[PDB]
Amino acid sequence: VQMEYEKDVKVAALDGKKIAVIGYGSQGHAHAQNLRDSGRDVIIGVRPGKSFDKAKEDGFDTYTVAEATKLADVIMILAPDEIQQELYEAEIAPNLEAGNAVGFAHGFNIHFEFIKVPADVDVFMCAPKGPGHLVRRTYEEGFGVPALYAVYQDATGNAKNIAMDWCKGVGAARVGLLETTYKEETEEGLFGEQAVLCGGLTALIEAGFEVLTEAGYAPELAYFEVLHEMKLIVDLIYEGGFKKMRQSISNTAEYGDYVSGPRVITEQVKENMKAVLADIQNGKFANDFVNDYKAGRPKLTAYREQAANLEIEKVGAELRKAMP
Amino acid sequence: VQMEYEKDVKVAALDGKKIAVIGYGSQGHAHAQNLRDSGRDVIIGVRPGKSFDKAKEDGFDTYTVAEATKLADVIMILAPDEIQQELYEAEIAPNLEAGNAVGFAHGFNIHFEFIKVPADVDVFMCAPKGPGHLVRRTYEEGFGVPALYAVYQDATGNAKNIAMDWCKGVGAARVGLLETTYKEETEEGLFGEQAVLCGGLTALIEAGFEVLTEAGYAPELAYFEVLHEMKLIVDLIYEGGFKKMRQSISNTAEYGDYVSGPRVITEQVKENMKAVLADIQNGKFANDFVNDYKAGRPKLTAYREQAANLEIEKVGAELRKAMP
Numbered sequence: 161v162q163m164e165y166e167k168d169v170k171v172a173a174l175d176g177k178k179i180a181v182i183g184y185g186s187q188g189h190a191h192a193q194n195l196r197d198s199g200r201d202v203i204i205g206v207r208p209g210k211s212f213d214k215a216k217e218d219g220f221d222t223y224t225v226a227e228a229t230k231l232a233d234v235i236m237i238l239a240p241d242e243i244q245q246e247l248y249e250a251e252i253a254p255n256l257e258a259g260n261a262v263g264f265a266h267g268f269n270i271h272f273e274f275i276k277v278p279a280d281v282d283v284f285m286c287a288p289k290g291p292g293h294l295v296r297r298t299y300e301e302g303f304g305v306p307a308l309y310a311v312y313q314d315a316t317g318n319a320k321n322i323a324m325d326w327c328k329g330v331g332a333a334r335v336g337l338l339e340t341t342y343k344e345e346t347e348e349g350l351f352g353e354q355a356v357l358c359g360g361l362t363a364l365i366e367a368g369f370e371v372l373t374e375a376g377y378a379p380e381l382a383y384f385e386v387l388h389e390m391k392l393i394v395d396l397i398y399e400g401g402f403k404k405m406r407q408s409i410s411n412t413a414e415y416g417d418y419v420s421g422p423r424v425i426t427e428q429v430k431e432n433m434k435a436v437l438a439d440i441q442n443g444k445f446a447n448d449f450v451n452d453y454k455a456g457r458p459k460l461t462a463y464r465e466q467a468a469n470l471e472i473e474k475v476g477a478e479l480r481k482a483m484p
Numbered sequence: 485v486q487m488e489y490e491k492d493v494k495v496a497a498l499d500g501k502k503i504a505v506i507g508y509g510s511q512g513h514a515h516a517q518n519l520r521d522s523g524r525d526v527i528i529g530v531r532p533g534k535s536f537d538k539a540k541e542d543g544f545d546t547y548t549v550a551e552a553t554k555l556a557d558v559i560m561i562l563a564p565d566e567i568q569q570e571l572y573e574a575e576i577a578p579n580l581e582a583g584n585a586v587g588f589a590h591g592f593n594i595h596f597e598f599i600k601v602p603a604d605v606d607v608f609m610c611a612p613k614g615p616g617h618l619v620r621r622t623y624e625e626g627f628g629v630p631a632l633y634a635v636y637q638d639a640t641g642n643a644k645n646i647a648m649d650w651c652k653g654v655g656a657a658r659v660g661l662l663e664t665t666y667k668e669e670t671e672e673g674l675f676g677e678q679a680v681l682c683g684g685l686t687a688l689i690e691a692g693f694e695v696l697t698e699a700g701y702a703p704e705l706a707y708f709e710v711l712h713e714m715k716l717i718v719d720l721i722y723e724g725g726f727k728k729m730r731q732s733i734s735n736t737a738e739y740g741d742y743v744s745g746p747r748v749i750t751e752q753v754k755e756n757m758k759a760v761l762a763d764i765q766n767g768k769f770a771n772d773f774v775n776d777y778k779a780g781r782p783k784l785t786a787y788r789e790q791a792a793n794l795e796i797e798k799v800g801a802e803l804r805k806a807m808p
């Protein structure tokens with residue numbers, strides 16, 4: 161297992177395919193525009209609204225989801241996670257034909273089988289390691305965003321070449337591709353964002369800010385010491401790992417890192433992470449997410465309002481405004 | 485208090501002061517170069533070596549530490565924390581006169597009283613929220629790095645104006661200043677790097693990587709899901725807090741953030757952080773750091789060799805090499 165590049169995309173499987181991109185938001189605009197600049201035959205299927213208008217004004221032949229699917233050989237579904245299933249059953253599935261291919265940028269609905277694509281139709285994935293605006297901008301500047309690719313079912317024998325050529329067309333093969341499975345992409349992706357990148361990180365910052373402000377330290381200073389200075393730390397890790405970061409910080413900071421990291425993130429925290437992982441693997445989290453959507457997003461509603469009221473967010477907004 | 489800027493620097497207290505920067509590392513070079521371009525009389529004092537004539541070659545009147553201190557009104561000490569004390573006793577303290585001012589960029593040795601400056605000499609601090617190369621670069625490009633300032637003892641009545649004019653001369657007043665105390669800067673700064681930015685963060689990432697690889701996931705994919713994509717997340721928080729970050733990530737990632745963050749970082753984790761803070765406040769951590777240095781850094785030595793052997797660091801180095 162090592163990374164693949166344009167030279168490893170040995171068949172241009174998107175040649176002569178009509179491509180429908182379903183949705184025209186962050187990913188949809190990026191995938192469609194990069195593919196068009198790479199010379200592919202791209203149309204957009206999306207509901208009426210600002211995405212429909214933005215696609216038309218960008219010069220794309222723009223249809224309903226149903227009509228775009230009917231016209232297409234390759235259909236990439238970039239609606240939001242919780243919308244895809246209902247949109248697939250009503251608008252996409254009736255308009256598929258044998259030998260088509262359906263793509264996704266994240267494996268959630270296919271892996272947990274909220275969507276089942278018929279067995280004479282390929283299912284592939286190109287999952288860029290970045291948001292849509294970055295996927296577009298790096299492409300325009302001559303490189304790209306690395307990506308995973310996978311195939312869930314291969315009816316034609318062309319599903320993997322289609323997946324890799326998709327990655328090449330959106331610029332990902334310029335920087336690096338990694339093959340995976342739908343299962344691993346979904347479970348590792350959900351785990352990483354929950355336990356480390358998004359959940360773990362924000363909860364860690366928040367706990368540190370609370371300890372400081374509850375001990376009597378000024379919150380403005382606390383904002384700088386647990387959040388603002390994180391960017392320079394993570395930039396160093398991104399470029400050169402823990403080694404480069406620990407070379408840059410003072411020796412006191414470095415010694416404190418080694419000594420106090422393990423006091424905060426303990427074996428028990430690791431066990432907490434294992435419980436997070438288990439609820440991803442057993443479908444509990446997936447059902448919880450979709451059930452919250454079916455109920456009108458009541459849990460997400462309370463979470464989003466509670467987050468808006470956080471002291472660190474209020475202090476941070478005022479500081480970021482006082483700082484060009 | 486909120487941020488102060490160039491308009492809040494009431495007195496150009498460095499006017500006609502002879503300024504010695506002690507050390508010519510990343511910070512020493514940045515501080516001395518910026519102050520020179522701002523118009524101040526800067527000389528360097530450092531041990532012989534490539535620092536000594538890096539400075540020689542950049543046109544700085546360079547001297548011993550003893551002789552540069554003898555000549556200066558303002559002496560800013562930018563040597564590493566564990567070196568400052570022996571350097572101060574042997575080389576700086578005998579060459580101070582009443583009415584001088586001694587500066588630091590971090591409060592550790594003054595706050596914990598490993599160094600005690602005579603009561604007829606001011607002690608101030610300018611602590612940029614950035615490393616040397618960034619303090620120099622941003623100044624060259626027209627702005628700067630924000631900074632804290634503080635005064636530990638004010639003999640002349642000019643110590644705060646000296647501190648704030650030092651901020652101004654290195655470019656920090658162009659973007660924002662926050663007054664603090666030596667005690668708060670030291671304690672909050674040690675706490676942040678230990679519990680959140682450095683210690684907590686690398687420990688969290690490593691715990692996530694361990695959970696994934698021990699559950700049978702390939703380390704290469706795990707590296708992307710707990711480390712590589714953190715830069716994009718932290719960049720978003722830096723620009724717009726949790727709110728902007730959570731708008732850009734998918735809806736499953738955002739829901740997973742709210743649900744699983746608190747399962748990983750629990751009340752017990754917060755208690756662990758409180759114990760970290762207590763050992764900063766009571767001097768235990770500071771004495772442990774200084775004592776490790778006096779014993780020949782045996783704890784730091786074992787930490788560093790263990791870190792070089794981490795699986796995430798080996799995998800990361802290979803993947804970063806495969807990604808220009």
Ligand SMILES: NC(=O)c1ccc[n+]([C@@H]2O[C@H](COP(=O)([O-])OP(=O)(O)OC[C@H]3O[C@@H](n4cnc5c(N)ncnc54)[C@H](OP(=O)(O)O)[C@@H]3O)[C@@H](O)[C@H]2O)c1
Nearest residue numbers: 183184185186187188207209211239265266291732733734
């Ligand atoms: N966020 C990330 O960083 C990231 C990274 C990798 C993969 N992904 C995955 O990419 C997919 C999400 O794509 P995205 O980020 O581009 O989402 P998005 O920015 O929120 O855009 C969603 C698009 O789908 C449209 N849409 C919503 N409901 C629709 C419906 N019934 N019928 C037709 N169109 C509809 C929306 O149109 P309107 O404007 O009218 O609402 C919009 O154009 C998910 O699978 C996600 O897991 C996300």
Ligand SMILES: NC(=O)c1ccc[n+]([C@@H]2O[C@H](COP(=O)([O-])OP(=O)(O)OC[C@H]3O[C@@H](n4cnc5c(N)ncnc54)[C@H](OP(=O)(O)O)[C@@H]3O)[C@@H](O)[C@H]2O)c1
Nearest residue numbers: 409410507508509510511512531533535562563589590615
């Ligand atoms: N790391 C950060 O991002 C950061 C941020 C804010 C504040 N600070 C504080 O900045 C201070 C450290 O400065 P720094 O980052 O510039 O460290 P540095 O890059 O390692 O520079 C150390 C300088 O001091 C010299 N030096 C070492 N021992 C000496 C001795 N006995 N006599 C004379 N000179 C000696 C070194 O010369 P040689 O090259 O010959 O060794 C070198 O020029 C600390 O107080 C730190 O807490 C650091």
Ligand SMILES: [N+]
Nearest residue numbers: 565590591592
């Ligand atoms: N220091």
